[PDB]
Each structure stands twice: as structure tokens, then as C-alpha cells.
Scaffold this motif. Structure first.
Motif: not given
Lengths: 209, 93
Positions: A7-12, A14, A127, A131, A139, A143, A146
Motif C-alpha cells: 500500500k502507498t500513502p496515496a492510498g493505492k 503498488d 513503500t 511523502e 500524514s 496512513f 488507514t
RNA sequence: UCCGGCUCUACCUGGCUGGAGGGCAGUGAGAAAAUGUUGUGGUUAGCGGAAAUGGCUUGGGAUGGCCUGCCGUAGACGGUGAGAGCCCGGUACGUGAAAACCCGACGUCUGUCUUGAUGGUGUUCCCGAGUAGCAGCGGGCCCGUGGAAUCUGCUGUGAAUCUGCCGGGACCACCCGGUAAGCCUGAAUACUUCCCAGUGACCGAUAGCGGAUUAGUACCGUGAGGGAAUGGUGAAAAGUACCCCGGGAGGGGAGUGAAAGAGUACCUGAAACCGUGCGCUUACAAUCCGUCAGAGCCCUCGACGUGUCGUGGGGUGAUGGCGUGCCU
RNA sequence: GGCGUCUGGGGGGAACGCGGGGAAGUGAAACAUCUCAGUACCCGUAGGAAGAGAAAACAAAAUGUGAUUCCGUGAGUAGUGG
């Protein structure tokens, strides 16, 4: 053979990381893990406790008074254990509590703890925590929320991931460990384990090689 | 102490919480200040009534517009001075 | 490399000594004493540093409980009237040296090689002397004299310079290793009177330093020396104005305090020990002082009447039976 | 030997170093060889560390290591001992 999706901090999502069976599918051994964590805590404890015996107290180098004629009990010194202010008979002394647990036991206990965590799919791969180039505790907290809703979590990131380590440092339930410093106590103390992709790959390469 | 003699402050805790006053004596050693009309006692002398020292953590420096704040410092780069400022508005206090 | 002055003297030849480049090193064991510039290099003072006067409720007080937000590279630790990331000191993180000192660096400075370097051939000299060796008496080596090697002290004796000498656990021969009787040498190692920053499944006032309080003090001994005991009112002194009894001490009102069952004899206030009041019992009685039956009196919990029983409970117990404290 | 003039020394310190001198209670169920112990203590000296240090060394036929020091093994072994 268990699959963990990154999982990525953007929410998608990888990709995926393949967990080897011999590292994440071993049967946990309760007694072995108990012994390993007990030895760990014993090694942590420092034995800085000391007491003055009958020979280290100040004074008392002379026989007090007449042994006979007084009508009192015979005493050899004023620093005897029965005397108020005298020495201690069997008191604490500085000592080392570390145990010489074999390497195989420690490795097996860590593997068992990791496999127990992975069986209930409490293992997560990311990952980056936040950021890069600037710590941001908000942030990182978002994360982690989530990722999981548990109380205590373990974050395993490389020694070069300064931004993530600083970001997740201040959270009350977050403990930060390095991939080469993984141990049974830290894994078992944590409800969820959050692995960095590079950290997870480094651990697998170091172990399964 | 970040609070000075002659500064007007608002008490934020204690029996006299919420009452405004003026600091008349400050004790850097004790972290205590003396304020107008707060923490008044009844000493037997007739029975006189006068203020008693209150810890500095119980007071807040009030702003120009009557709003309590934490005080901050800005450095005057022209003359090297260092003056107190309020964090609620940034104005000089 | 070049130039110059010397190898008794001048002339043609080989060696010494100074002056210019050029190197090579340096406060170093390899020689030494200095003098400048520079390093956000260090140490010896510091400064900044995010976010709640939030609402309801208990409370003397919120830092308690419930509910709202905010910061977080800062939820380390203390304080503030009770468990505080957002009240304070601070913390993460950045910043700061006039001067002194300590580390480096580049220099002046110092020495030093350049009158030098290479690989070859056969002979004389040198290679650390009262030293090695030996003998006597000892020390220490796993080795306590033992067949006793190596090392070493005192006393005698006392050699060789390389086909020389020493060692290879008596000793001899052969091989092997090394080159004594001259001197310096950094690092890896041991420790903490003292300073700084922390830590603790260490103690919490008969404990922990002898010493949290006049502590090596009081006191004891001529002297060397020995060597104690004593912590806590309260959030703040607001430490009881005033009246009364009393010479005072002390106390009773009155006040302050949330509490005076916190009054500077002060948090909590046990046991031993000493009182006061009430209930039972005790002056014809031979008592390891209790235990088992047990009349009477007093108290108490229920039911029914006016006092009388009950799957009752307690206190004291006249009287009878039994009964030789504990430990070694 | 005297005179004059310069440069040094003297004492203190908790531990660690080096070089000397060096016990006894104890164990051996007695005790003298032995142990305790080169300990306790004393003497002379330093340094920030000290001492040692560059083979008249080990080794055993390996065409072997290569100043000293310190730590772990070797090893409670080979041995030594009324």
C-alpha cells in the motif's frame, strides 16, 4: 506462501511481496518464545544494586567491651549483622543477568512470532510512511489509521529512512525498529507489523539466503 | 518570568479564576507574583485583608484587546533588542 | 646540477669544505626552540522553540470523569491547590563566543641530501670485556636440587671477533635458528581525587554513605584513635485578632482554614504502658489461670402480646469434670 | 675549602605502574618442608598512562612464523608436590 499487497500513502496498491513459508509459516512454539523473551528481558535489566556487608561498613574494627563480667551477650564487633547499623548478611550485589541463548532458538522464536502475526494477516507492507523530505506526523498517523485500527503497532524501516522514523516517532503506540534489529519481544508486543518494502526485502534476503 | 511588575494579567486557575488584575510584585526566585484583588486573605493584625502570592503558572498575560495569550519573543535586528510579543495577534505587548 | 675555497707549496691529476638552485622531513622515537594566518573545528556563559483562558459535572482547588478541537522532527522528565503534549521550566529541532585554552591546516622557521649514485673482483682489520663461560652459595621459572636446561644476585676465576659466540631442557657430534655484553620508540592495556550528561525489576529515615538535620560534628581517650542521635503542619502562615480563668504554662469561647479527629509538642497515629465511665463477677477460699458442661444477670435479632420461645447470636460467668508453660 | 653569581630540587594527591624488603592468624583436621603469599604492610620513584619492545627469538626438518603488549583457547592439561 502468503501474499502481502503493498500500500502507498496515496492510498493505492503498488504491488505484492511473496512471504516465504519457512519465514512466515512456521508453527509457533510458546515455550521457546517464552524462554527467548525472558532471556531478552534479563539482558535488558541492569544489576546496579549493592549493599555493604559486615566487612565493608565503616568502623567496627575493635572488640567492643569485656566478654565476661559484664553479664551481657558476647559481641565481636559493633558492625555484626544483628546490630542496628551493621552489615547485611546476604544482600544484593552487582551482577549480570544476560543468558547465552543459542542462535537457532532466537531465530526460530522470531520466525514463530512473525508467522503468528502473518497468520492473522497482521503484516502490512508500504513503500514510504509519508511523502519524503519532510517529517509530518499527521500524514503518518492518517496512513497508519488507514492501515490498521489497533493500539500498538511496529514499524520496520531502514536506517536511511529518516523522514518516516521522525514522522512516526511521536505517536503513542508506535515503536520503530530496524530490519536487522528485529526480535521476538518487539514483534510479540505489537498487534500489527508495518514493513517497509525495502526493509521487508532486506530481511527476506538476509534470512532466506 | 515572561510576566513583569506592572503587567496586567488574567488568572486562569484557582479560586479567583477568571478575574483580571495588575501585577504589582513579582518573585523570580519563587515563580510567584502579586496581583490586584486576587488571592486575598484575612490576616489577624482588626482583621486585615490583603493579597497573597500566586504561582506564575496560574496567570496569563492579557493582550491589548483583552485576550489572554502565551507570550513569545521576536528579535529586533536593527538594534539587537528582544521584545515580547503575543501569539494570538502578533502585536507588541 | 652550477659556483667557490681547501687537500705543505705552484704546475697536469683524485679526495675534503663553503655559496646558489632543486628536493626530503619536522616539534614527531627518528634534533630543537619559536612566530603568524585560517577552520560555524571543539570546550569554557546562553537564546529561540507548535498547539485549549474549550464546554458540562464533582470539588477548597482540576492536573479527576464525560464530550469537543489543536500541535507533533516536540506524547522525555519535573512543577503548578489532586493523573497536564496544548499553564510554566522545558523536549524534538535550530542557533551563539568578545576573550582564554585545546585540536588541525597552510606558512615564516629549523635541519637535512645533494663532494653524488650503481651493480662487480681477491686479500688484512673491526663487529660493544673484568663481559660470556666455569666453580661456590641463593632467587625464580610446572620444576620443592633433582639427570636440571634458559634467566638472575654476591664472591673467586676469567675468553674469543665470524673455520667467533650463544640457544634448540644434563651432555657429546651433525644440522637448524640467532648475532649478547649500547640506547630511544606511538597504538592495542589498567584506573578515577575531580568536572559534565544520564541510567537503575537499587534504598527510602533502625534503610541507603558513619553523615537527608550543627557530621567526621557533639561526645570519649593524654595519644594514635573511636564516634553517634535528630526528616514530613498547611495549597498558601491565612501560625489563632479580641474576650474569659490563670503569675505563667495551659485551656474555654471567637476566628483562619476544605479539615485545628492539620496549632509551629503540628501527615497517617499501631503495639507495649497508664487512666476515666458503664455491664457481669469477686471477701469459707489451695486457681500452668485454660478447656468441656453450666445456674444466674445484662445486651441484641425474629415471631407471637402485654411476657415467652427460637435451626438464634453475644458479654460476664457461681458451680462440677479434666488439665505438670514455651524453646534448646 | 672559601667568596660571588645563575639555573634546578624540597611538599601534597583516591586509584592504576615499575624496582626492592617482606609477615602471621589460616589449610595441611597436629606440625617444621609446603600453603596462606610474594598477599598485608613498608621503602624509592614516575607518567597520563607506566613497564616490555625490534631476536645472541620460537620451531622441527614444514623449501615453517617473524618487535613488544593485551584478550580468548590451549588447560586445571603436560607436570610439580612430606
Amino acid at each position: 506462501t502468503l501474499k502481502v499487497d503493498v500500500k502507498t500513502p496515496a492510498g493505492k496498491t503498488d504491488g505484492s511481496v511473496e512471504l516465504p513459508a519457512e519465514l512466515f509459516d512456521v508453527e509457533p512454539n510458546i515455550a521457546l518464545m517464552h524462554q527467548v523473551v525472558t532471556a531478552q528481558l534479563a539482558a535488558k535489566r541492569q544489576g546496579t544494586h549493592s549493599t555493604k556487608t559486615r566487612g565493608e561498613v565503616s568502623g567496627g574494627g575493635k572488640k567492643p567491651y569485656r566478654q565476661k563480667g559484664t553479664g551481657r551477650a558476647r559481641q565481636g564487633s559493633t558492625r555484626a549483622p544483628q546490630f542496628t547499623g551493621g552489615g547485611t548478611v546476604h544482600g544484593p550485589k552487582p551482577r549480570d543477568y544476560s543468558q547465552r541463548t543459542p542462535k537457532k532458538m532466537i531465530a526460530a522464536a522470531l520466525r514463530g512470532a512473525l508467522s503468528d502475526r502473518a497468520r492473522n494477516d497482521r503484516i502490512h507492507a508500504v513503500t514510504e510512511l509519508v511523502e519524503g523530505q519532510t517529517p509530518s506526523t499527521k500524514s503518518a498517523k492518517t496512513f497508519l489509521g488507514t492501515l490498521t485500527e489497533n493500539k500498538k503497532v511496529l514499524v520496520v524501516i531502514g536506517r536511511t529512512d529518516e523522514v518516516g522514523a521522525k514522522s512516526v516517532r511521536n505517536l503513542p503506540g508506535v515503536h520503530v525498529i530496524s530490519p536487522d534489529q528485529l526480535n521476538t519481544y518487539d514483534v510479540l508486543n505489537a498487534d500489527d507489523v508495518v514493513f517497509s518494502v525495502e526493509a521487508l526485502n532486506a530481511y527476506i534476503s538476509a534470512n532466506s539466503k | 518570568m515572561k510576566v513583569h511588575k506592572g503587567d496586567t494579567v488574567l488568572v486562569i486557575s484557582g479560586k479567583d479564576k477568571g478575574a483580571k488584575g495588575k501585577v504589582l510584585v513579582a518573585y523570580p526566585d519563587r515563580n510567584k507574583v502579586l496581583v490586584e484583588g486576587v488571592n486575598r486573605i484575612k490576616k489577624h493584625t482588626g482583621i486585615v485583608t490583603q493579597e497573597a502570592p500566586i504561582h506564575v503558572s496560574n496567570v496569563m498575560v492579557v493582550d491589548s484587546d483583552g485576550k489572554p495569550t502565551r507570550v513569545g519573543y521576536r528579535i529586533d535586528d536593527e538594534t539587537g533588542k528582544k521584545v515580547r510579543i503575543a501569539k494570538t495577534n502578533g502585536k507588541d505587548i
